[PDB]
Amino acid sequence: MNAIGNFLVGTPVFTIFICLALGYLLGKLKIGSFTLGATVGVLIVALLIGQLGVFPRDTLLGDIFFDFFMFAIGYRVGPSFISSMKKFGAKIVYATLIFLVSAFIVAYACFKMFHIGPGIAAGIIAGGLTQSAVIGSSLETISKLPISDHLKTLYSNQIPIVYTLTYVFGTIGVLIFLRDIMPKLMHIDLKKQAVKTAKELDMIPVPVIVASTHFYTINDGSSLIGQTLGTVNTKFAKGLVAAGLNDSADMASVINAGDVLAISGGIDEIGRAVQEFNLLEVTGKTKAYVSKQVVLKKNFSADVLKNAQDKGVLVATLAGDVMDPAQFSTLHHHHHHKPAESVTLVGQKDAVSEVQSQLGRLRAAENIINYSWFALGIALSAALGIVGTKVSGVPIALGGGTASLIVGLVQSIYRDKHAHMDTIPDSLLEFFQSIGLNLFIATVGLSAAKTFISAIQSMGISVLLIGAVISILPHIITFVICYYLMKMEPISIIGAQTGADTLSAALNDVSERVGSDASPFFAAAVAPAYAIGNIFLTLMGPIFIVLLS
Amino acid sequence: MNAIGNFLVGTPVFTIFICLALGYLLGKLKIGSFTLGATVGVLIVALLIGQLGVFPRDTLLGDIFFDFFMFAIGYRVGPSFISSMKKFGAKIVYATLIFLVSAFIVAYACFKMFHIGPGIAAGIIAGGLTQSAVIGSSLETISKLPISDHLKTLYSNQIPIVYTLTYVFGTIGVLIFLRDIMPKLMHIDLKKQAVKTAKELDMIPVPVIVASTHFYTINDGSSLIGQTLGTVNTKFAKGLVAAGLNDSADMASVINAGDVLAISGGIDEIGRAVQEFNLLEVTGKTKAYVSKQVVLKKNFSADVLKNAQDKGVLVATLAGDVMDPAQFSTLHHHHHHKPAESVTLVGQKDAVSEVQSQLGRLRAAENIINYSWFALGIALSAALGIVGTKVSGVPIALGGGTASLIVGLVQSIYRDKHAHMDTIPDSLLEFFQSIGLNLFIATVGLSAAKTFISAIQSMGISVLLIGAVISILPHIITFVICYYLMKMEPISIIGAQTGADTLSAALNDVSERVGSDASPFFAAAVAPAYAIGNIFLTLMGPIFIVLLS
């Protein structure tokens, strides 16, 4: 057991990554009533392994990875954030403030009764509400408070112990209440309700007929023979444009026998045209027919957007389906706001390239990774989380969470505004969201493992129960209020309570249960509540440690 | 300048991530004769920023990220490794040993002349050949050596200084010689030569006609009306199988007017069938027609693989193109080795599902991420890099590099053998390869920044020139030998020299210049040379520090 501990402490990489492996395993496992979050599995694994020896927490590792997690969350919700805000901002901020005042009142009422102290009280606050800066705030506060050095040392030792005692439950029990008990209580399904709430907003588009380019070998005896490519393109209805005979786009070459006519358009229209002209389709050994996404530069005329078809170029929505000609006027640009609309040009390389150069600039493929963009994002997230101020002598700061969310939001919004620059693949963003918070949790659990059982031994039974009460009851009361009176959206209420409590494990877990469809809406509903609750709790800890004097 | 330094040292996250942003920028920039590696840009940025204050290097950060980089390299080359080995293993190991003996002889000849000492000699070795364990080996060696404490302290202080002095050049100049001067010297292009060398091996398949399922509305007046689906499927030649009338796979329902016949097969064959039967194509609003990749369980009969077509199921290669019926015998499984071949089943959900259950199990989509697999991989990479032994009192160990490469190799090979389990997306693997080594470089450069200029001031001019010579000349001599005599593959020689020198920046840079096509072949050509050179250099440092006495 001690050789195990020596090897472990001497190999932190292995100690931490084996914590994540078994953690994700425990998360995957389940009995029936939903499953355990990968985050919760990693937490359990880390708290158990930490019982072997002593494990020093790196604050330049868990910090980096929590930054990754929150910046990914913020960078995914960038576009859909403003809309979900304009939709439910009033309701979500009301819920956040209701939960905050209810938590304050509950903590005050519980600390009025029971053997209670200011250090233990601040520890219960920091632990049961999942706030690791309340410790620092209340510690500096009690330092400023005019008390004997012995009492100050006593409280400064008591606070972190009770924090780690209540932290396990503040992370697990509240998560299980918000993710499992709370949906079933509102008589809904988390996944279905979330995906339908997101569909209700313009962020989950429906499938579209991809307007592609087919190739047809002109066998002998067809009415198209001897006829000019331009004449055929004219004969083609709307949604169908003759991409070109053979591999050229000259609308003057005569269609001869044995050539290959390429046509761009929707599948149904192309099938009808094939039946009418009895066309023989062929694989088409040619790459000279490519589709390109172009971001329209304001003041683009549209005369070229109109002559697209007459030029052998199919213009379609960014989704893919060929766009109605009149809809060229929805690409108007007026007033300001400027989320530039993007077109898709299909056809011959020369014609498509000229129409693109006339319309705008090529949109960057999401598959490409903008390493410098990601690096600057993380750097500025850190620089903004370091920012802070003092309120009544209490030091407060955005911290990693709120600053990372804000930087992700603004950076994703700017990238969506200027779509010519590369971005971060959503696969990488999901990987960050999943791995960063779980590494943070593994480190903090390895650090607070032995401490947790020590606190269970000393002042364990009563304090842990009081902390569980303080953590769950505010959620119950604010949920009752919100749902049964204000009648807010269930997923919106869940996001608001997850934010107001600063429970980042809830973010990750509810997102992985809801899927990448309504995950943007959930993150949007969380972010503002997250910031407000972070501030008010970092201030709530010290006011309590002062009141208790 | 000092407020800058205070803010920087107080915000390591920002200090490191702004180093990566500007680093990737400097890498992107270029004049004409190729560009600067993103790694080299990050190195320059870190060495310049480090000139502000003092920056402590986290060994549980750079270590994790270098592990990520090397494990990604090893996990991508898993499948293609064994083949490239069987192809050029003799040549690559010959090149590795030739380079090692030439470097040893060059170092000995240069240390015989010039004001030379054992500490400075070991420092030049550790710096100009990019080996940060030579420091530890030679330090423990000189510790064991029976000398006055003053001399031991003198040498132990001299070694790291000369190491950091020569490290910048060992990372930049040798990289520029192997990536730019060396290809042009062999009169080739790195990208083209690499991609064609990889094409020469079965790892870059050519495009294939994707055998898809089309839908055709049975207008009135077609010869298929009143005819049974089974009869039509029979009438369909090879490569064409009637997926089913409407949305069912019963080969007894009569084809009525207004129904929709779905047909699976290649585009050319389907076009010929459409022309012959004058079929009207339609978008097809149905998901009940799906394609599934199945891993064949040994002892699968093939009778079902034969009845696939007669059942309304198109069997195709994993690539997509419908496979020749006789080729069902290439899916034989015999002897052992067992890289189970996978089929693709297209058609109706019920028929395809039954044929799959009869043939094998569903292959996992690469888009899914196996977090537990990745975690266990990193953990075991660390546990294996910790392994080591002693040779003549010299401590040696696999370290992070060789152990991570071995674990990646074996884990990727096992996942390719058992394809039912998820994997790591190649996008994530590329992101790791790019970001991990560059973070390692940023940290080590921030740490060795002030030290580098200090060493430039003290014993700077002569030592840096001698180190540049020791670093470049071995490459020149071994390249001459290999190319102009042994006549090995250019890309193979480059990979062998990159491995033998333990220059991980060369791995990353040459891979990003060659692309994901021949990058597996390059990593395969590197790995063995990497291990052998790592060992022989960790042993070469101490033997030199001993000889110099």
Side-chain angles (χ1 to χ4, degrees), chain A residues 35 244 418 424 457 483:
Chain A
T35 82
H418 304 59
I424 297 75
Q457 277 300 294
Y483 193 82

Side-chain angles (χ1 to χ4, degrees), chain A residues 9-29 31-234 236-244 246-333 336-337 339-355:
Chain A
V9 70
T11 63
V13 279
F14 176 95
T15 297
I16 299 168
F17 278 84
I18 204 75
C19 270
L20 262 51
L22 300 175
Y24 282 70
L25 266 60
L26 193 58
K28 280 168 64 66
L29 299 188
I31 297 79
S33 302
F34 297 150
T35 82
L36 188 74
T39 307
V40 180
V42 173
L43 179 62
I44 295 173
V45 171
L47 291 175
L48 289 178
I49 287 164
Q51 295 298 342
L52 289 162
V54 62
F55 293 102
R57 157 159 130 67
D58 201 322
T59 57
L60 201 66
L61 188 65
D63 211 335
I64 279 71
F65 273 96
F66 182 91
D67 299 356
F68 280 4
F69 158 80
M70 283 301 242
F71 176 77
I73 273 181
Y75 197 80
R76 285 213 297 185
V77 68
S80 294
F81 175 72
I82 310 178
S83 192
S84 179
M85 290 304 94
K86 191 184 297 303
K87 288 171 68 59
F88 305 118
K91 295 300 187 66
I92 291 178
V93 76
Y94 300 163
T96 302
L97 268 58
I98 287 173
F99 166 85
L100 284 173
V101 65
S102 299
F104 172 86
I105 295 168
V106 169
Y108 178 81
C110 288
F111 297 167
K112 201 272 173 178
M113 193 56 179
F114 311 151
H115 42 78
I116 283 284
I120 295 167
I124 294 175
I125 289 171
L129 276 63
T130 312
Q131 186 73 312
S132 62
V134 161
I135 67 191
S137 68
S138 75
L139 198 155
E140 182 164 332
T141 301
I142 187 66
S143 305
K144 178 266 175 185
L145 196 69
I147 320 292
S148 151
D149 186 306
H150 298 66
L151 287 299
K152 290 138 64 64
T153 298
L154 181 66
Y155 293 153
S156 296
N157 285 276
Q158 279 180 346
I159 279 169
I161 303 173
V162 183
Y163 158 79
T164 61
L165 179 62
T166 321
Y167 149 91
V168 182
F169 193 96
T171 305
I172 299 179
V174 165
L175 175 54
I176 296 300
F177 171 86
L178 292 187
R179 188 200 65 197
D180 301 349
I181 283 285
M182 191 160 166
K184 301 179 185 179
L185 190 52
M186 294 182 293
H187 307 98
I188 57 165
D189 180 69
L190 194 67
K191 165 56 179 181
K192 178 200 66 50
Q193 180 52 28
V195 65
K196 91 187 294 298
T197 310
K199 286 214 305 301
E200 235 290 334
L201 177 52
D202 278 277
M203 67 176 72
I204 303 304
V206 297
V208 302
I209 54 181
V210 301
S212 64
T213 298
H214 300 66
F215 302 79
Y216 299 97
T217 184
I218 291 295
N219 50 271
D220 192 322
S222 181
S223 57
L224 306 173
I225 301 173
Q227 203 179 160
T228 310
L229 179 74
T231 314
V232 183
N233 174 22
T234 47
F236 283 146
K238 281 290 165 295
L240 297 173
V241 308
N246 199 319
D247 287 7
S248 63
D250 193 315
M251 294 281 181
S253 55
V254 300
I255 297 172
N256 311 278
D259 301 2
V260 290
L261 182 67
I263 301 163
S264 316
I267 304 105
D268 52 325
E269 304 161 1
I270 286 176
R272 242 171 295 99
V274 166
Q275 191 197 21
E276 188 181 31
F277 298 88
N278 188 98
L279 297 173
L280 169 49
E281 191 174 341
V282 176
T283 50
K285 183 204 303 179
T286 296
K287 304 205 303 180
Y289 291 90
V290 67
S291 62
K292 291 298 188 66
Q293 300 178 336
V294 180
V295 184
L296 300 180
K297 74 198 186 186
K298 66 94 162 182
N299 308 10
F300 64 91
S301 194
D303 283 0
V304 58
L305 193 59
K306 214 69 65 174
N307 302 9
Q309 161 161 1
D310 203 6
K311 200 179 295 182
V313 168
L314 191 77
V315 305
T317 65
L318 185 63
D321 57 76
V322 62
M323 65 176 71
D324 190 310
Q327 291 172 12
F328 300 167
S329 195
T330 68
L331 287 42
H332 56 93
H333 308 149
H336 261 299
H337 188 323
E341 180 61 16
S342 181
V343 303
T344 320
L345 308 185
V346 193
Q348 216 278 330
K349 192 71 175 185
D350 298 352
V352 77
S353 180
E354 185 274 356
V355 175

Side-chain angles (χ1 to χ4, degrees), chain B residues 494-522:
Chain B
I494 293 175
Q497 280 179 211
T498 285
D501 196 294
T502 73
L503 183 57
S504 301
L507 264 172
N508 188 18
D509 202 332
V510 170
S511 292
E512 73 180 3
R513 297 293 172 82
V514 156
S516 188
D517 298 317
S519 176
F521 179 81
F522 184 70

Side-chain angles (χ1 to χ4, degrees), chain A residues 12-14 17 21 24-25 58 60 64 68 209 219 267 271-272 275 278 280-281 283 371-372 375 379 382 431-432, chain B residues 12-14 17 21 24-25 58 60 64 68 209 219 267 271-272 275 278 280-281 283 371-372 375 379 382 431-432 434:
Chain A
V13 279
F14 176 95
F17 278 84
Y24 282 70
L25 266 60
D58 201 322
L60 201 66
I64 279 71
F68 280 4
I209 54 181
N219 50 271
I267 304 105
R272 242 171 295 99
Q275 191 197 21
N278 188 98
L280 169 49
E281 191 174 341
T283 50
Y371 291 92
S372 301
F431 168 76
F432 292 167
Chain B
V13 279
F14 176 95
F17 278 84
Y24 282 70
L25 266 60
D58 201 322
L60 201 66
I64 279 71
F68 280 4
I209 54 181
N219 50 271
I267 304 105
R272 242 171 295 99
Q275 191 197 21
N278 188 98
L280 169 49
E281 191 174 341
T283 50
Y371 291 92
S372 301
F431 168 76
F432 292 167
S434 181

Side-chain angles (χ1 to χ4, degrees), chain A residues 353-360 362-406:
Chain A
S353 180
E354 185 274 356
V355 175
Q356 164 270 328
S357 71
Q358 295 268 250
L359 285 173
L362 210 169
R363 172 184 281 258
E366 184 172 6
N367 50 19
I368 302 170
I369 313 183
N370 205 338
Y371 291 92
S372 301
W373 202 233
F374 175 69
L376 177 62
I378 297 294
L380 299 175
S381 294
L384 184 63
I386 278 290
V387 180
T389 185
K390 318 299 174 64
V391 178
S392 304
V394 170
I396 56 185
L398 292 174
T402 300
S404 180
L405 249 59
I406 293 167

